[PDB]
Hints:
The structure is a homopentamer. Chain A is mostly beta strands. The first copy, chain A, has one domain: Capsid protein VP1,Polyomavirus (Polyomavirus Vp1, Chain A, Sandwich), CATH 2.60.175.10. Chain A has strands at 8-9, 18-25, 65-70, 82-95, 125-132, 137-140, 171-173, 185-187, 195-202, 210-214, 219-220, 235-248, 254-258, 261-273. In chain A, the strands form three sheets. In chain A, strands 3, 5, 9, 12 and 13 form a five-stranded antiparallel β-sheet that branches. Chain A has a four-stranded antiparallel β-sheet with strand order 2-14-4-11, with no helix packed on it. In chain A, strands 7-6-8 form a three-stranded antiparallel β-sheet, with no helix packed on it. In chain A, β12 and β13 form a beta hairpin. Chain A is globular, with a radius of gyration of 22 Å. The termini of chain A are far apart. The interface between B and C is large, with 65 and 72 residues. β8 (194-201) of chain D pairs antiparallel with β9 (210-214) of chain E. The structure holds a molecule of 2 linked components (GAL-SIA) (4 copies), calcium ion (5 copies) and chloride ion (CL) (5 copies). One chloride ion is lined by residues 140, 156-157, 170 of chain A. One calcium ion binds next to loops of chain E.
Amino acid sequence: SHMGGVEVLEVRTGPDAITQIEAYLNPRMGNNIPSEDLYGYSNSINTAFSKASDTPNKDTLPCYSVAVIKLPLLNEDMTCDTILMWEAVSVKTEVVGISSLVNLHQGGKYIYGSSSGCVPVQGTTYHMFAVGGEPLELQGLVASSTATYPDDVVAIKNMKPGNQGLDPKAKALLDKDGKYPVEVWCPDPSKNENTRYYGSFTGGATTPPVMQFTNSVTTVLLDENGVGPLCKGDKLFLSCADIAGVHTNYSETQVWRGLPRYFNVTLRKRIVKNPYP
Amino acid sequence: SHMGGVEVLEVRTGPDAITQIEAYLNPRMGNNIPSEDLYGYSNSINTAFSKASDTPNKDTLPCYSVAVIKLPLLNEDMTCDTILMWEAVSVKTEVVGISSLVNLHQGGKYIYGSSSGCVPVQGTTYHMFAVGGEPLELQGLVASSTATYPDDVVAIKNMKPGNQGLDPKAKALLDKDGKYPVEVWCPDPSKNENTRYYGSFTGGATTPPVMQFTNSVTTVLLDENGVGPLCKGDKLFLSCADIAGVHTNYSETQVWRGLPRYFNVTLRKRIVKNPYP
Amino acid sequence: SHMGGVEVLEVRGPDAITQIEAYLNPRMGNNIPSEDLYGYSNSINTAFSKASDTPNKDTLPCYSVAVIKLPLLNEDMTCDTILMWEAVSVKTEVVGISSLVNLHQGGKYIYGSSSGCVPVQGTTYHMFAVGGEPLELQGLVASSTATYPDDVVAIKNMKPGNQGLDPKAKALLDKDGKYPVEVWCPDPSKNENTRYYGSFTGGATTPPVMQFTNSVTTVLLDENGVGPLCKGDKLFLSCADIAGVHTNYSETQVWRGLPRYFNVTLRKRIVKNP
Amino acid sequence: HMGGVEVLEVRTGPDAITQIEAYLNPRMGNNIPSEDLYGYSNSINTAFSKASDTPNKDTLPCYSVAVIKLPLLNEDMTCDTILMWEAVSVKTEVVGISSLVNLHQGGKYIYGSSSGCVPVQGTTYHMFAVGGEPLELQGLVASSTATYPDDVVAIKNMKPGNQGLDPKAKALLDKDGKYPVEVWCPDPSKNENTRYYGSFTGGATTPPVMQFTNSVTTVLLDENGVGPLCKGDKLFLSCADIAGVHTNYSETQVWRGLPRYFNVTLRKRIVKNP
Amino acid sequence: SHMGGVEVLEVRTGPDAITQIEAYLNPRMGNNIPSEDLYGYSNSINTAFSKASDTPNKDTLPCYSVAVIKLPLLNEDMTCDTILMWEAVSVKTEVVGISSLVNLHQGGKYIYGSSSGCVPVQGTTYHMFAVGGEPLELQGLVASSTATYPDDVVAIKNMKPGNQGLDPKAKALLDKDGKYPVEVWCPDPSKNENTRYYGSFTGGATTPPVMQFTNSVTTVLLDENGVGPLCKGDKLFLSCADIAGVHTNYSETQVWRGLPRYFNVTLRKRIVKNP
Ligand SMILES: CC(=O)N[C@H]1[C@H]([C@H](O)[C@H](O)CO)O[C@@](O[C@@H]2[C@@H](O)[C@H](O)O[C@H](CO)[C@@H]2O)(C(=O)O)C[C@@H]1O
Ligand SMILES: CC(=O)N[C@H]1[C@H]([C@H](O)[C@H](O)CO)O[C@@](O[C@@H]2[C@@H](O)[C@H](O)O[C@H](CO)[C@@H]2O)(C(=O)O)C[C@@H]1O
Ligand SMILES: CC(=O)N[C@H]1[C@H]([C@H](O)[C@H](O)CO)O[C@@](O[C@@H]2[C@@H](O)[C@H](O)O[C@H](CO)[C@@H]2O)(C(=O)O)C[C@@H]1O
Ligand SMILES: CC(=O)N[C@H]1[C@H]([C@H](O)[C@H](O)CO)O[C@@](O[C@@H]2[C@@H](O)[C@H](O)O[C@H](CO)[C@@H]2O)(C(=O)O)C[C@@H]1O
Ligand SMILES: [Ca+2]
Ligand SMILES: [Ca+2]
Ligand SMILES: [Ca+2]
Ligand SMILES: [Ca+2]
Ligand SMILES: [Ca+2]
Ligand SMILES: [Cl-]
Ligand SMILES: [Cl-]
Ligand SMILES: [Cl-]
Ligand SMILES: [Cl-]
Ligand SMILES: [Cl-]
């Protein structure tokens, strides 16, 4: 016999330099208030009369979700040569409520005739998330520059046919929840140095949606220089859009269906040369 | 000539500190008793008259399966500073009966006309499993808050339109086999620190199902800190749902079809600082 | 200049290692090469009702199995140890994939009478196993009220429980072309001495997808680094390769199967005598 | 004790390394930003016959190309060695993917007149290239009897041989919006100093699939560890990104393209003088 | 300061032990000669009257392509203990002309009605290539043993229903360009020890084709014992078939469409015990 090591499991608090935050963001499909009958869906998609006359109704346009998480205060003021900042190092993220689509009794269009189940949510899907130290920077680009956007969303200013491609004047920040339409704004790849974003799109009229869920997967947020998003003003920005498809009603009107997203982000305190003038 | 080693194969007992458990869980599609004619399927899916009037018939809603496996007793009592616990380290799992779908003579809707084979099981699929040291923690989220759920399932209490998104009040434990509907409950990603879960969904009205099977794949259950699920009260929780799709009858009525899942979990004895007060 | 090595290629293997090659022809229902429809089932006859569902003989695709006798290792079976063949790897391929690339075979038309004919499509099921004893099977059916014909092995005393997993419904894959695919699947609770791999895609008319290469080897070693051990010096090769169904002009349908090739490497091992 | 601590700060990369960024707008046929259908083709007009197939002006998607002038490296060009920029890696993204998530744009209805409109779908073609000279093209067409419009670069003296690979049908991607996608592909027999990557999915009505992230870098070094070398200090960026077709209510169809962003990292290298 | 190395880039010729060859193989769908109007396509697919009466017209059957490339001569003396052989160690290969399918104006069946684009090439696809030191060895297997094959293709001798499965007598060598039908012959996995082959099939009546192209990808040809194909008689065999799908005419007649394949093969000289 001899003295030797044995590993005992116990509750461990990590070091003071590490923190984790959790949040969820509910979808902003157009009915964005929990009291609304169609919360989590858009209103019925109204289609253009013509190219020139294309005026989506209020609440028919899915928008990005964003939350700003206030992190623990690190500095007394911004006067020193170096400051402390939170660096986001990894994220675990999940789309919540996927199983809710496994439902063929909800009223709608029938799969076959009136004795069958109803058609589930299907068609175009769009799933993206971002984690950054400032708002996600957006680029405007639309299917049609002659669409008239509702007052209650943020559209491209002074739209022209050039906005059917990439016009460098069409820029915005994702700084408001449920206001920036998915069909108008995409992540700006010429910026976003301090954000990590990931997106998947599948189109088609009636395409089957595909989604995974697990609590086993972590995404590392460090860039090619080994540095994660640095949280300006001790704020963490979480952004997403999770359009599962459209639901079709018996009359063939259609509404977009979105799902919430969960985030768990790990951050560490870093010494940073002070960027604030 | 020299003395040297040769490796002889033999029946080896594992260390006393390691055990394996095997179990299977039969599906709970609605007909949940083996004596029922439609065991392994739901009853015919009855669709809503309207948003306001949507009352799924008894036994038409697939539910999660759960089994609690009692493991060998490790402690005389719970009074010491440390205790022994079983830690789940890996799982091999398989969906059983996949080949039963390779059947075009079962009565149903014809692929072409009356001389052809019948349409096989297809449409929405949902496959998930979990292995944990306590019940899987669930989040409620539904397609429609105005559905009336049957008495024999566990539904969200005081359901409101907010339940079409994520409401943090809508929480449950998967603590009853064949009682928690798939379309109401999903894993809660904000909890489940002591469970590992994995899920895959594909929707669509008539989508071909895709399934693999092999006895060559092991999934490691250790988390990011190298710790597997720790079995509270010497109990192992195995959870799953395996909806293969729907079978369509000649009359075009439709029933969900589920399949059983097999689990083989390897566990090891660990010394753990006593969690019980 | 100096003495040094150069690698010369030549024909070469040790007596402790052997390779076996085999092919298994499909057993779709027409299982004898003299049959007109060899490699296909007979026309799929569908159920009148749940209660009345009587598949005609040879309309049910079955698993293939071959038992390969390996070189005899022990003249004496009474020592502390015996020798056994351990299967360590397999190369396997579905043969005849290119035969589906045929739009002139008579059948249902893709468009009208001027177009090509619909190729084999619909449900596919591809699996293989390599083991040192019969593949162990679990019975599970779509409908317990089907009446299976007397030329196939089906579940004994079938009941509604057999639409799920009933632990009494067990069998060994020990007869070529007699165990229906739709009745039997690998039993994951056993098969410690077999490795199996399977892929299924359903749907009424789904396009089949298959690859073929001679570049891929599958290692058969389990989590303890041990391959299947061939009891009585016998190697068991099992498979099913259903490519889809062929549709005739009258809309009757037949299952189409393809052969599978195996190349298994084995090594002699010393094993403690049971 | 004295020890290290890692402080984060802005670092300017070595003088030997530079990054450039650029975007290239799609050239689907309406290639001028003032045009109503900018980012789309004009309505696809189909052949009357094999012999009479004359696509209208601006109905043919063409490749995009941009030449990026890098910092001048060499005062004297008669020296034994020279400096050149070597492209080592690229980050690239298709911009405006989310613009397709739009079911109110006027067109064909998914179901009836109460439903959303069919989104962009059908054939897709996504490719990019990063090189130190123009992308070298091979001509190959579906039909040698098509008459191409004056405003595009077609195969010279086109003959039925051009429905396969004729080594006389070669070009350089040296003009933006002039080389039709359906006439020209990358020439795999050349392009030693370019890296190209392409993905095609066909079909009449196929759902488009596209990913977007800022987390992915592609390494441009070849099997000898060498990236594209920028001749005359010019970097060539090429692409085509056809998202599918939009279908109008009258059933006329137009190609839809999307822009592509490039971020390329380059390093100065000593190169023996050609 | 000090003496040190700097890596200068220059044109380097490989060592004499290594060579690279490039080749392209044009498709052999039935119209196999460049002067033919439908070069790169089959003739219209004529369907069987019945199982017993199934007679595909000449040049309606896509066939494998093959090229035999003569490598540098290695042995003037074939009687020593050893000989030199070229060993194929890697290949870069690409399907050419993928972009030609991105064409909705070619005459044919309409996607919707007469105002829409025309249906592009779709349906069954079959893409394979092989690199070997001798002809690809083939196994015969057909959908129907009662088909009558034309005299301008090599088919199974004395065909019987057994040929709807694997009959070991049904064997051939891919030794003629454009004469061995894809629907009759597949690689023989029981042979081909001196060839590497790779193939992908997707069936279905109207399936969208999927193809990739890049010059960044190399496939290693070394087998499980670390040995690539050895080129007998200093000949390299390149084989392929690349059926992209079918084109449908307005009358609904259908033709197979094939595409060319490019090969770039790297080989090294090896000492080999003289057979
Ligand atoms: C996304 C969703 O819940 N859609 C509902 C739909 C909406 O409530 C409605 O379209 C919003 O205006 O309602 C559906 O049920 C309808 C009944 O509520 C109504 O009394 O009568 C309608 C007759 O066409 C219809 O049955 C629907 O529009 O199909 C059900 C659907 O789930
Ligand atoms: C999943 C399954 O077994 N479905 C059966 C189905 C059910 O047994 C039934 O719908 C539950 O009440 O029955 C099917 O066959 C039917 C006959 O049993 C009945 O005598 O007549 C029906 C006339 O439409 C029908 O043929 C069915 O509904 O198609 C067979 C099916 O596999
Ligand atoms: C798999 C196969 O070869 N199928 C054949 C089919 C078979 O002979 C059998 O019927 C399948 O169960 O026969 C097909 O050809 C038929 C003629 O042989 C017969 O003279 O008349 C039929 C007219 O409806 C038909 O043309 C078929 O049923 O289409 C051809 C098919 O390839
Ligand atoms: C790609 C695109 O934006 N297509 C438009 C289309 C085009 O503006 C036009 O076909 C090309 O010059 O126009 C669509 O709307 C049309 C109206 O502009 C017109 O007043 O009436 C048409 C009646 O059939 C039609 O409604 C179209 O063709 O559907 C809308 C489409 O987004
Ligand atoms: Ca920038
Ligand atoms: Ca939590
Ligand atoms: Ca067991
Ligand atoms: Ca060349
Ligand atoms: Ca052999
Ligand atoms: Cl703007
Ligand atoms: Cl609740
Ligand atoms: Cl039994
Ligand atoms: Cl030319
Ligand atoms: Cl022969």
